């Protein structure tokens, strides 16, 4: 249905004479398409998908100048926040930034975001109306006032509802063979006895994309969620995802249990049981 673009930035101070570590990553939906890293030899924005390499030198020069401008801004913020919190010179500290936009299935703008964090905690975030900021603590009040006086929201809103949407439409069309696919889970079930009276049933989903899936167990047609074990969704490494859900069943009750799988690649929710 809807689609989204995200850029994720991380900057970490290294005490003494060392430069901060900086890393930037770009995604369309679940698919990564670009990177930058301060500790790489190339010092360029690099492609991470087959459909983006048709972009010319004018794209790769512009993107390289703009990740270096974010990189240079975070070096100054690391030194500033150390002071706002009255912290000592001895430890490393981390800044994280996420921004991007959501575009609907008809190509219209749905919403945009920006979020900042310092040492893993919320610092400041843009409100859903793209007009004002929410501060997390007393040091973030200084930044909120500074960014209001500078009208930072007005520049960022004009990117989020404008340029972010145009380039998302371009990527979705230019990669339509790969970004707009839907692969159903190649489901199966396995039986693993654990004792003379009990066995474990494991219900699997493999090879699916996008990563949004539900797995649930029922017994006699009643939900067993509180007694279910699940792994969190994991990448396969080839553009697909894996998940499983499992329950301990007393020996002889395997026919009373049933696993339900729900995903966009399935015309209706799919049921499995042991046989």
């Amino acid at each position, epitope marked *: 249905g809807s689609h989204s673009m995200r850029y994720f930035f991380t900057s970490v101070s290294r005490p003494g*004479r060392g*430069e901060p570590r900086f890393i930037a990553v770009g995604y369309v939906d679940d698919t990564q398409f670009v990177r930058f890293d301060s500790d790489a030899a190339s010092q360029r924005m690099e492609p991470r998908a087959p459909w983006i390499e048709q972009e010319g030198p004018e794209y790769w020069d512009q993107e390289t100048r703009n990740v270096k401008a974010q990189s240079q801004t975070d070096r100054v913020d690391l030194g500033t926040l*150390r*002071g*706002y919190y*009255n912290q*000592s*010179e001895a430890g490393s500290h981390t800044i994280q930034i996420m921004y991007g936009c959501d575009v609907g299935s008809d190509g219209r703008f749905l919403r945009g975001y920006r979020q900042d964090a310092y040492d893993g905690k919320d610092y400041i975030a843009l409100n859903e109306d793209l007009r004002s900021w929410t501060a997390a603590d007393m040091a973030a009040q200084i930044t909120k006032r500074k960014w209001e006086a500078a009208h930072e929201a007005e520049q960022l809103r004009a990117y989020l509802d404008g340029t972010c949407v145009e380039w998302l439409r371009r990527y979705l069309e230019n990669g339509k063979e790969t970004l707009q696919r839907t692969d159903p889970p190649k489901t199966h079930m396995t039986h693993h006895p654990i004792s003379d009276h009990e066995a474990t049933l494991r219900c699997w989903a493999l090879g699916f994309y996008p990563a949004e899936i539900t797995l649930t167990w029922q017994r006699d047609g009643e939900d067993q969620t509180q007694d279910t074990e699940l792994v969190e969704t994991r990448p396969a490494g080839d553009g697909t995802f894996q998940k499983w859900a499992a329950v301990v069943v007393p020996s002889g009750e395997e026919q009373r249990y049933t696993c339900h799988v729900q995903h966009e690649g399935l015309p209706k929710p799919l049921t499995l049981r042991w046989e």
Partner: antibody
């Protein structure tokens, strides 16, 4: 890296001071440095005047005690920068230093210094 | 302002402490501090570039520290060669203007 200062040792009251600091073994438009002016006088100790630096564009900071009278100008063709301080009154009598700071040490860690120039304000 | 004691003194081999203190206008300010030695007739020279950080191993006698609005330079093993005027340098947080301390004269008994 060497920093070489030059300019007049005497300026008349209410005239303009114009000093050069010329850079050797380093580039004025370098994106990892900034170029500074500091002065020393027995009634005020060390006083900081301002900086200029380049990233993709030129930027500057000036101290508020002289902000209205001061400007620091780079010259990329000669690889130097100059201090212009207008309306020199007797209170501007000091020894003037140029200095470098980089990005590996923070701001205010003046790594390399020039030979100080003694400036006199008298009729 | 960034005030200092006018002068300190010690016999050869003793430790002497120089401190410089911010005006207590706000608590988080003066976080990055650096220290300068000035011998008579020449430019200041950098001893310490952030609190307790030395440019190189040549400055082993010199030890920087901070507590509240106060920062300090300790000179251990004081030599007759260590008689000089010493200045700290720092800036308020949210500002780009550097300030120097008033200066402390370190004097060696002999």
């Amino acid at each position: 890296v060497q920093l070489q200062q030059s300019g007049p040792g005497l300026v008349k009251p209410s005239q303009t001071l114009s000093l050069t600091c010329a850079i050797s073994g380093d580039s004025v438009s370098s994106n990892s440095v900034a170029w500074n002016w500091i002065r020393q006088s027995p009634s005020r100790g060390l006083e900081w005047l301002g900086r200029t630096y380049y990233r993709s564009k030129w930027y500057s900071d000036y101290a508020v005690s002289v902000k209205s009278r001061i400007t620091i100008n780079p010259d990329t063709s000669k690889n130097q920068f100059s201090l212009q301080l207008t309306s020199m009154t007797p209170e501007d009598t000091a020894v003037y230093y140029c200095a470098r700071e980089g990005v590996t040490m923070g701001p205010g860690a003046f790594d390399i210094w020039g030979q100080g120039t003694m400036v006199t304000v008298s009729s | 302002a960034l005030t200092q004691p006018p002068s300190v003194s010690g016999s050869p081999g003793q430790s002497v402490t120089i401190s410089c203190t911010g005006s207590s206008s706000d608590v988080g300010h003066y976080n990055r501090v650096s220290w300068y030695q000035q011998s008579p007739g020449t430019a200041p020279k950098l001893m310490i570039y952030d609190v307790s950080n030395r440019p190189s191993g040549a400055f082993s006698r010199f030890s920087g520290s901070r507590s509240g609005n106060t920062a300090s330079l300790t000179i251990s093993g004081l030599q007759p060669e260590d008689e000089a005027d010493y200045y700290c340098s720092s800036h308020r947080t949210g500002y780009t203007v550097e300030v120097f301390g008033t200066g402390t004269k370190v004097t060696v008994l002999g």
